Amino acid sequence: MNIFEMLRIDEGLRLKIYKDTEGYYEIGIGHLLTKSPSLNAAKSELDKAIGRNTNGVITKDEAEKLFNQDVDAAVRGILRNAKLKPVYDSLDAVRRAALINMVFQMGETGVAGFTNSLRMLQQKRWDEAAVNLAKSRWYNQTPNRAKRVITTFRTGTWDAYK
């Protein structure tokens, strides 16, 4: 159990371009293609990522690859961000994965926006961060996922994934 395994549970694996619960197009393991409604712009984003004509279908290996780069970018994003970095540094290993998970799903700037929730995590007020984490658009968008991540931060265990 780590970020790689946690994300696999949260995102699934699809070798064909798909729509998320918001109508956006993703592929592989949560790799965002485009928020534009056209399936063709999505195919286009795709061939540019891969470097080939894909017709909206990729190999599993290509999926794995993308995933690695994505997890790597989520970590880079936490490390260069002045608001997230001091938080991250302060967390144990389990909670760290919970933050990389939000970042992979919302981006550095989107997570950097959870001002109250980050103040609480930074101060080790786990119950109160969980409550603040729930008052968000994120949670109203993807509550089941958000609920598993918030339990991780609350508890510091892999309980919601087990």
Binding site: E22, Q105, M106, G107, G110, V111, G113, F114, T115, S117, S136, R137, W138, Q141, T142
Partner: peptide, 4 residues
Amino acid sequence: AXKX
């Protein structure tokens, strides 16, 4: 997704 996405604090609002």
